[PDB]
Design a binder for these strands. Structure first.
Lengths: 99, 140, 198
RNA sequence: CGUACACGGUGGAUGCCCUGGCAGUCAAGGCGAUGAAGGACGUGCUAAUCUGCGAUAAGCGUCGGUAAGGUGAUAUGAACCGUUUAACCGGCGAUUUCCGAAUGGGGAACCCCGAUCAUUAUCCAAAUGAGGCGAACCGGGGGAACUGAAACAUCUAAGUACCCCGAGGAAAAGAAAUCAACCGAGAUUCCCCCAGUAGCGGCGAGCGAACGGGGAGCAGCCCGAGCCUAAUCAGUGUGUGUGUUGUGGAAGCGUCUGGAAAGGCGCGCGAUACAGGGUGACAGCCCCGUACACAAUGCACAUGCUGUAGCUCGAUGAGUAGGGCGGGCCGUGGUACCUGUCUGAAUAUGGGGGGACCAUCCUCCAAGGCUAAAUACUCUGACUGACCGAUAGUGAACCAGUACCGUGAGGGAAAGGCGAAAAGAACCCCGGCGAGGGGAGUGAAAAAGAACCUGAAACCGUGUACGUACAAGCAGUGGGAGGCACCUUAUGCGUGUUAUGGCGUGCCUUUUGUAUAAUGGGUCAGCGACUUAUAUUCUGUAGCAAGGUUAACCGGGGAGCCGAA
């Protein structure tokens, strides 16, 4: 699954190629990564979608479908950041099949 | 494979008899429709088991006779001749389908083949005297 | 005659068994037409307790009416009520057994000794834990198209095949004509045949 | 103003979904005067509800598990805690104000004390018991009626409803003065059968066993003395089979559509693990979970062991058996059982019983007592269901047994869903105006905006097609003439609609007869009315065949039933 203590790599959105850590995950499936932000009116570095209106959620609203964590396949993506105190998870992290 | 099988689960196999429409059959479907013997059909059924009566009133009646010995145990010839052999008196009857908790019986020459085994029984009728005499043996 | 059995390797021959009964394709097919889903609550006429309540309880003018668990029954003028026009005490079936049901239960057992039918499998079949092994033993058996039919066995319910195409697992003990031949076709095992013989 | 349709609204059906019910199954099973159940009232920074607690108040402590996230449901603002490893999960311990069955007394929660009955009694309440609660089941007593008998006083419903008292997790029964096919069976209940037979009955309707057999479960023993020690009693040690949570746990693949797949299409896989749910749209191979594994607790039923401790001899219970009078009740017949009054034996060299009485056989011996084991329900935990789906289903999937009603007992609703996220209508104009919106913005498949998915009918508005202030009425049909309007079904072939003419008295039950001044409906949708055991008698089909089928319980049986004179 996806965690907040992990780094993601865009692959489709206009932010394709950008790197960053996962800010937070909502029960909606969307994930906001430290980097994919938008320029508000008074030019305030705050993530948000591009649409006119009053008060709307923050976050650029990224999708786990176009992201890139640890995909077991041939892609253009590269290294990705990932607990350790678990021990058993370290074994999976050591394996080139899981994490 | 991983494709939804054409079928296979519960209502699979053979059934009972002729092409049954739905569950055991009805007569008067739901809603409204004749279904009945017309007239004042409702309150309570017609018959009662007896009559009014006129035939049950006081015809050539009788009465309940006392319990009988509940004799009358078919022990026909053959089926005992073409079966087993000698010694067939009061001791070897359980082997055959002749063994009532009560007592007595009778012999009814169903066949004529000689055996010529002897048989007690405790009863006797016509034909009983015949056979087991011209063939041998002694009845009681 | 001698029904040739098959091992896990679907050998050409193993043991032998058979059943004696005048097969009736018309009757067996006359079997696959009666209750695939025919025990789903009928709608008879005269089959239960039903004891009056007499006077008392709750004040209010009311007449004698069938009351089962606050549910009306046997009362013609109410869902599931008395059917004045007797003869057909249930729900729409078919003008139709003591010899067709059972007789078929026997005739079916004879349908197995037929060429263009199933085949007996050794007892080791029930052992096969996996399901893929079955698909294989059914492929080499040259009867992979039997999945298009159904499947059976003996002892306990063979789980390892409950997934295979069309498979209503059942035991030789209590095998109604149903499992005997799903859609006038089937397949059983060794011990099964023996248990079914009786 | 008639009718059809179009756009918008009203309304809410329908389609889909559903954190709910309904039903079955397994496991498990009492609480309290060490004052419980329930209720009242507090308690979180704000919190009005619910839940958790309770003044160390949705919390405190220990151990173990677990883990970095956490501070209940509400994802708010503020803010706190956590590595001196919290939250959370399991067990246990500490504490636990006042009132409260509390019983000192009074009392609609407030003020002062062991109240009442009873046993022991150092008679000092000093030492103890009872006084409450709890789904049904169980035992011992009291005991109807309507109803059925198509009247009714026997009978029947009832030995039921209801009432009184009481135990357990289980009770009651019980070792035979029995049964009685027998040179036999042989503690008692329960299940099946024997019987719907014997028997009872205005013998009318109805009522209705038992012995035996086949099974489940098997255990026998104690009241005077003699003697001596392994029944019993007292005490000690103290289980095998477990309860919850966490650990050993594989897995986005490709193309296309889309904001997103749990799509279509292609391919592969799990299975001593072929339930279900979650994850942005139908993923058993994404996550949990299902089989599985391990550790924390409770129960630990039993066994072992110490001291007691065998065994032996004789007898065996009179106001009883039995009889009479008056009743209850039972299938109980002069031949069931029990209560009340009166009378009243013998005694094993005796007596009772074997469905009549009295003399003669067989069996067994009362008038004393105890006794394990074999089924019930379903609050609770878990699972399942070809069950229903929010005018369905429990009254309750939304504050519900709440709103609300009655003095009270009691009665008792309606209201589901935007979505990927958040939007849920910013900004501007008008106007008296946060109560009337153009415009515009939001959108995915929201033909989405605060009871928001879809969103019909009755119906309303505008508008369109077409009649229409001489017009006669089922308002059609065929024939021939008229016009207007449209050439997504080119062919002298059709529609919308209408002018005029020839004909034409809605629909449904009751009734001999109803269009009818016979009866019912204003309209609409939904809802709403012919079944569950068995027995008997016929009919259609089909296998087999004087043989045939079983029932309890076992794939075995053949009891038994019907037929065969």
């Amino acid at each position: 699954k996806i965690r907040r203590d992990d780094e993601v790599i865009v692959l489709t959105g206009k932010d394709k190629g950008k790197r960053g850590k996962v800010k937070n995950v909502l029960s909606s499936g969307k994930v906001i990564v430290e980097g994919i932000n938008l320029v508000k009116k008074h030019q305030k570095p705050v993530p948000a979608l591009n649409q006119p209106g009053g008060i709307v959620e923050k976050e650029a609203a990224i999708q786990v479908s176009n992201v890139a964590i640890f995909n077991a396949a041939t892609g253009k993506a590269d290294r990705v950041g990932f607990r350790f105190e678990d021990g058993k998870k370290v074994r999976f992290f050591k394996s080139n099949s899981e994490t | 494979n991983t494709l939804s099988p054409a079928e296979g689960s519960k209502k699979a196999g053979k059934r009972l008899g002729r092409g049954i429409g739905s569950g055991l059959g009805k007569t008067g479907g739901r809603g409204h429709k004749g279904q009945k013997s017309r007239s004042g059909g409702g309150v309570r059924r017609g018959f009662e088991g007896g009559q009014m009566p006129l035939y049950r009133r006081l015809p050539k009646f009788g009465f309940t006779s006392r319990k009988a010995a509940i004799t009358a145990e078919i022990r026909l010839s053959d089926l005992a001749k073409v079966e087993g052999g000698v010694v067939d008196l009061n001791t070897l009857k359980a082997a055959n389908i002749i063994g009532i908790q009560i007592e007595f019986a009778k012999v009814i020459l169903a066949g004529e083949v000689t055996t010529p085994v002897t048989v007690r029984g405790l009863r006797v009728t016509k034909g009983a005297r015949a056979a087991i005499e011209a063939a041998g043996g002694k009845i009681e | 005659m001698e029904l040739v059995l098959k091992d896990a390797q679907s050998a050409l021959t193993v043991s032998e068994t058979t059943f004696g009964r005048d097969f009736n394709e018309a009757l067996v097919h006359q079997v696959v037409v009666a209750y695939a889903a025919g025990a789903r609550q009928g709608t008879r006429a005269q089959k239960t307790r039903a004891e009056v309540t007499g006077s008392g309880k709750k004040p209010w003018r009311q007449k004698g009416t069938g009351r089962a668990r606050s549910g009306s029954i046997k009362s013609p003028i109410w869902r599931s009520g008395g059917v004045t026009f007797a003869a057909r005490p249930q729900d729409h079936s078919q003008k139709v057994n003591k010899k067709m049901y059972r007789g078929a239960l026997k005739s079916i057992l004879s349908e197995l000794v037929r060429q263009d039918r199933l085949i007996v499998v050794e007892k080791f079949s029930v052992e096969a834990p996996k399901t893929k092994l079955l698909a294989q033993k059914l492929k080499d058996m040259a009867l992979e198209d039997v999945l298009i039919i159904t499947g059976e066995l003996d002892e306990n319910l063979f789980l390892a095949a409950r997934n295979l195409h069309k498979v209503d697992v059942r035991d030789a003990t209590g095998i109604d004509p149903v499992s005997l031949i799903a859609f006038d076709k089937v397949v059983m095992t060794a011990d099964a045949v023996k248990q079914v013989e009786e």
